[model samples]
Each structure stands twice: as C-alpha cells, then as structure tokens.
Target: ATHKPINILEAFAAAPPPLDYVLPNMVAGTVGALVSPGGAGKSMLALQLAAQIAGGPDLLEVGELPTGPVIYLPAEDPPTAIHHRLHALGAHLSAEERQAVADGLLIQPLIGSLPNIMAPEWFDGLKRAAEGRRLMVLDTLRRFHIEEENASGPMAQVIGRMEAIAADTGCSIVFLHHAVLVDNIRWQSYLSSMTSAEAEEWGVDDDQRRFFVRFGVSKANYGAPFADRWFRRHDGGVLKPA
Candidate 1:
C-alpha cells in the first residue's frame, strides 16, 4: 500500500481528540490571566486561589476539590509579608487541613526579581518544586523583569518561558498580569480585544478555556468566554464569589 504525506496543518486537522488527561478540569492547568487595577484586590484574590487549591477553605465558595500541592512565586511580596497575608486570609487550618496544606503548599519569594528576566535555571527550580504539584502561580509578571512592560518582544519572551514551564511540569501555571488603563467609554471593548488577542496566542486548544478574572470573557479561545464574575476578600481573608 502507498501512503501520502501530511503537512503540519493537515496532521493537526486529522489528529484524534485530545487525551482525556489534557483538558483543563481534569489536568493541572490555568485558564487565563488574572488582571485588575491596583487596589482591586488582585493579590488577595490570587492568594485566595492558592489557598483553596492548597486545601484551605474554598475562597470562591465553589466548594472543595481534590487537594493537590501548589507552588506560588510572588514577584512583589516578601516571604514574611506573604505569610501574614495568608494568615490574615485565615489560610491557617486545623490539624487535618494543616496537614493537607503542609503537604501541598510551597511559596517561593521573588527568585527572579531585579534586572534579570525569566531564566532557564529559575524554571529548573520550579520543576523541582512542582514535582507533585497541580498548580503554580506567578503573581504579577511585571516585577519579574526590568524591561518596559509595553515591549512585546520582552513580554513575549517572558510569556514563552511561562508556557514552557507549564508544559514541562504538567502543572497549571497561572499568571497575574495588569490590564492597561482605560477610560469609561472604551474600557470594556478595549479589555475584551486585548484578552481575545492573548487567548488566541496563548491558549492550549480550541476550547481556549483561558480566563480573565476581573471581567467576564475578556477572551475565551474555546467555549463561552464572556461571563461576568466577581470576587471579594471577606473579613475572614478568604475570597468568595460575590
């Protein structure tokens, strides 16, 4: 029997459905960038996410999930400050919960701060830390490098590094990024367009599954991306869907 050759696009077109393990809910992965203006509670919100995934209470009131380990690398806060914040959020748990947290949570201070950008070695360190983890969170991508934030080349490089880290470690890597400032008249459209672009570029598959935390459906590569969602950090310091 004779066989015909296939191009990259054709091969992809003819490819079988993605493995059951590759989807977002089943596998460890991120949906989209978590963005908010300063004081909009981005950090607190992210911490809440980490806390829940780390086996703390469900900050979003979404209920518990299968507990898994997590590594959170914050570019802005020091270790002490992070600890305080976590405590303030009531991230402290009871014996069983604490054991779960201890077994799963790992926080790394800004290991990539300063004039340096994303380094291969940093990812190597991440690989080691994520050995048994299901998620990795990078808080505020701006502080990790010294380059101008608007520069696409550098930004692309940084995002590429993050993608590689996520792929290699098989863990969902969530990045905290800032949305550009916008005026009332055009803010919604602007945010939507920007998110769509990011999803088109960075999403894993057709479903897009990428998320924009502050505003609903800033961009969705696959399913419905537009859904208004709000979260607040309660007095207890946990994030809850509002």
Candidate 2:
C-alpha cells in the first residue's frame, strides 16, 4: 500500500511541525481565496496584503509580519493602475521599508490575452517565480480560467492544481474572486460594500460608509475565525484598516 498507518501514541510523543504563516492566520503551502463584491476594494486590499508581507506599512490591524518575497499577478488591472496604487501605499513607507518592498515584491499586471491558470507553460513560469517566495497573490480568478464557475467538477480541478502549486513551491497562494462565489479553499474571506443598515449597526456615520467595507472570514480551517473587520478605502483606491 502507498499509505501507511501512523502509531498515534508514538506520533503524539514527537513534536509537531510549525505552521508557516505568510500573514496573520494565513498559512503557507496552501490555497486560500479572497472574495468581494464589485468595487468593494478586494484588489486594493490584496495589494496591501502583498506589500505588508513583503516588508512594512502595516495596513491591516494584524501585527508585523516576517518580511519575505511575494508575487502579485493582477489579471484585470493595467500596469498604470498598479503603479498608482503602489504610489499611494509607498507614501507611508519608511526608507528601509521602501527598500524592503522594492527588494521583495514582484507585481506583473497582465496585458492583453490572459493566460489560463492551468496552462502548463504559464504555471511553469509562475512556479519558477514563486520559488522561495512567502506568498503569491492572483487577483480576480475569473479572468485566469475558461471553465464554467457553476460546475463543481471544473472548480474542484482548478483548486486541486492551485493546491499542488502551493505545496510544491512552499508558498501561500491567494486568489481574488467575486462575492457571487466564496465556496472553496482552506482559508476564505470576503469583502462587502457597506450598507446604511450595516453602518448604523457599527455606529459609523452615513457619509463615511461609502469609503468603508466589511471584511469577514468565512472559513478558517486552522484556527479561530477573526471577527469581521472594517477597512477604509482611501485615495487612489488603497485600503487600510479603519
């Protein structure tokens, strides 16, 4: 048999392996996803997350993360848009933090003719790029695949390949998808545009709610779920914990 049973008592006697965290509660070597409604700032949140992992500018309330290399591939945004967002985030970085981001983060905004996520050649390129990286963020998963989202088989196959990529490279892979769907992966989160009712419940002002969004963790397989948080979308579409 390819698989063997483990002796429970003997296993319990040994120390367990540490979980590799790319960000607070986001485990490495696994596939996770971030979902959001259109214009809820998921892409901006994703970039901030990538930058934080790269080095500094603790945008989210989570404490400082260990600096490491991160790759971000935005299939839906243009290079100019990415540049603008980076400029906004860079305004808050110290000189050393700027250097850390410059040295550790790699962002490739896809141009015309997007590559399928499962394409062998494209995946190979990504695999090479992800080597030794702490995290990889793929923005808006819908653009990378050509399969029916409603079909369970296709979705499962897609996630299977994503898991393999993460496991083989030892990097956490997070994809951005729409809020219309949020049903895959070990760790899952979604963003929602703040409604007047929600703002009232949170004691937030009506005028300010336009810039605020609700962030919730729908699934957290490894630990306790984080309480839903609020983030403010600032100028140039940069997201910061509010």
Candidate 3:
C-alpha cells in the first residue's frame, strides 16, 4: 500500500491550538510597513508600539496590548534619546513594566548616518533576539537597507527576509517605511476602497502577507491592517485618528 505525504494542512490539523492565548493570525507572522514623509512621527509611533508590547502604558491612545517580550531595533535614534522620548510620552509604566523594558526590550543604535537599506545580518540578529520574543519592530526601513527605495526587487527581498525571520521565530515583525509623498492621497483612496481586487492584488488574502498601511505624518499599526484607520500626531505627543 502507498501512503500520501503529510502536507502543511495535515500537520496543522495534528497540532494543538494555542491554549489560553490569542491565536496567531497572519498579522503575527508577517511584517507590516508604515510609510510617510519626513517629520511624520514614524519613530515615535514605533516607540509607542515597543512601549505597549513591553507592558508600558499605551501612547497611541490604543488600549493595553497582549503582554509579551518585544525587541525594538531603532536604526535612527540613540539610546538616550529614546529614553527621553519615552519619558515625554508619559508612559507611566509600572515597576514590572520598567523591568520588562530593561530585560525583555532590546534596542540597537545606528552607527552613524542611516543606511539606504538594511542588510541580511540585521535579520540574523533579529532572529536571534526573537528566540523567545513575541514581537520585533524595525524603525525606518530606509536606515536598514542599502538599496534604492524605488527598486521593487531589493525591497521585496528585504521584506522576504523579514517574513522568514518571523516564521522561524514565531514572532511578529513590523517595518517602518516611508511612502511616496505624491502617492499618499491616492493610496489612501485605494486603501479605503478595500474591494476584493485591491485586497488580492496586495496579497492581503494570504494570512502570512497581511499588513496595515498608515498615512499621516506617518502611518502606524496595532491591530488588523485593513481596519481603515487614519491617525495624526498632534502637539504635546498625542496621536489621534483623523
């Protein structure tokens, strides 16, 4: 008698569901990119996400998040600068949250000026840090890579590596990116349409290739990507959906 080979579906069926925890959706395995123009507060938003996942108080006006260890790789700001920003945001974290940030949260300072693109070694380090981590944030894709922004192949490759890292470690990765200034209005309209064709064209149907695109000073992500949310950064460090 001949037997058929086990497929991913079969293996998935055999595996048990995550107990007493949120199920891992496509959002968990893929990296979401936030694009915007300069001074758009992308870095601040990224830091807010890091803070929330580290058990710090929510800074985006989004409520509490699922508690877990998170690694934040900021390729733009210095460690001290990040610290001051966190304070300015009035994180008001607890002792445990502080401890978590100290122990569970990690940051990497950029050597000098930001790179045009990120390197493979960066993903390697992310994989290492994500061994037991639940979330990974790469602030600003421009600083991470050495390739041209308009080049699709190089961008796709870098994003593919990010996906691989997320899959390997069972962690969620978020990419901070910048959208073309002219495309912002059109992209917003396109995103708002959210028809089947648009969804499929962007590979949003796949559970592993989902993302949330924000357009303001910069975009941000928290929950579902296609949730049709728009936010703006105001004075005194506040983000409000506009």
Candidate 4:
C-alpha cells in the first residue's frame, strides 16, 4: 500500500456517506446487541422482529423496518415452534402482506448450534445467506459460544467478527443475547435508581413494571445508536416496554 497523507481538514469539508437503516437507528453495516437475562422473553422480541420485517403488523413498540430480505437463525427454536409463532404473529396482517414478507425472509433455526461464528466456513455460509439481505438476526448470542460474557477480550473478538461481516455483506447484524445474571448483575442499576421500599416492591409488581434488561450497542461501526430500549414479557408471550 502506498503512503498517502490524507488531509483531515479537507475531509471535514466533504460530505459523509449516507447511513442506511433497516430499522431506524439500527444502521446497516453495523453490529448491535439486544441483551437481557434468562426467561426474560428476549427471544420473544426477536421473533416478533422477524414478523415485523416480514410485512406483519407492528406488534412491537419498536420502529418500522425497511422492506428487503432478512435473515434469522433461531438457534434454540425448532421449526415446529416457529411454525406456530409465525401463524400467531401474522394474525394481524393481511394474507397478502404476510405472504410478501414470507417471500423475503430467510430463516434457519438451530444453525447457531453448529459452530463458532469466528470459523471461516461458518462465516462464509452466513455471508452466502446474507448476500441479498439487509438485516440478519442471531438470537441468543450465547448459543454460538466461545468465552464467557465477563471475558471481555475474546467476546469483543466475536463482536468484531460480526462487524466485519456487516461491512463485507452490507447488512446489519443484531445479536440478541442474555444479560450476565438475571436477578442481580446487569440490573443493579434498577436497584440503584430506587428506594429500599420501592426495590422491595419491584418483586411484587409486573404491570407496567417488570424485571430489567440492557439493550445497548455492543459494537456500532457506523451511524448513531438509537436510545437503548427496554421491555418485559406480558401475558400470552407479548412484549411491552418496561
């Protein structure tokens, strides 16, 4: 590579490339995380996201998705389960809209159970799956496996790998994962932001209130992040903002 001293000042005067989003603030060519704890209905939100992208109604409080192909690997979900969920999720949309989204989405459950994403062949297969897609979701990130979540360095490597995939394939990668410890570790802030009586009451209330989660960008190599969204699982597997 030739050494070229680029002018930073001139760059500042030039226009930046346009940011592409599949779901607003979830920019294409970037990596994002959706984190929470076990039994927290994290997967429920992800499943609904698939439906939303596939031309279903806005069952979620989240923003609209730009229409294009979407990829999902519901590693923990068997095909039979997904079949049931899809029918339920599509109940609100017209038959035509549901079919439209179905035509564009590429879902493969249990693929994440097979290999570490850092593997060359796994990545290559994923790239092929994502070739014409705008968004790809890898739910339950821990399922892919490597080091622990507390192991920041190698974990960062996994995140980095996804970011590279994002750039190479021109798609946004959303990692839906569980938080460190459900009862205490990640939601300490919930404890910090309240009183002894209120904290005590948190256990009893599941109305507009529920257990906490952390949905922030683990690695965003592009446009600005949307404010972190929080949610809780309501009756009948519904997701409502927490």
Specify the highest-TM-score model's number: 2
lDDT at 106 for candidate 3?
71
How many backbone collisions does model 1 have?
A: 9
Q: Find the 10 residues in a row with the least total lDDT in model 1.
A: 181-190
lDDT of 4 at 143: 74
Model 3 residue 189 distance off true place after TM-score fit, in angstroms: 14
Candidate 2 residue-wise lDDT, 188-229, digit = tens: 888898988988888877987888887877777665457888
Q: lDDT (CA) for every model shown?
A: 0.56, 0.80, 0.56, 0.62
Put the candidates in TM-score order, highest first.
2, 4, 1, 3
Give residue 181's lDDT in candidate 3 (0 to 100).
21
Q: Write candidate 1's Cα lDDT for 1-242 as tens digits.
A: 12366577976778665432211222344323666555455676666667677777764654345557777888877777777776766544566766666667887788445424466666567666656577777677677666677677766666666555555666766667676211111112112222455546644333432233233534333432344544433553444565
Q: Where in model 2 is the C-alpha error above 4 Å?
A: 1-10, 180-183
Off by over 4 Å in 4: 1-18, 180-242
User: Tens-digit lDDT track for model 3 on 1-242?
Assistant: 12367687877778754432211122455456555555556777666667667666654554445767777777777778776776765545677766666666676666464543345565566678777777877776667777766766766766667667776777777766655322321111112222345456755574422233343322323323334444544444444443
Instruction: Please write out the lDDT profile of model 4 over residues 1-242, one tens digit for every residue.
Output: 12379989988998966756666455666666666556656566776676677566666566666666788888877888777666665665587877876887778888436757778888777777777777788876777656677676677777777767777788777777654322211111111122245435545443334444434444334455455555544454555456
Angstrom error at residue 221, model 2: 1.0
State every prediction's TM-score relative to the real structure.
0.65, 0.90, 0.63, 0.71
Residue 100 displacement (Å), model 2: 0.8
Which residues of candidate 1, in runs, are more than 4 Å off? 1-31, 63-66, 91-95, 111-117, 180-217, 223-226
**Residue 17 of candidate 3: its Cα lDDT?**
46
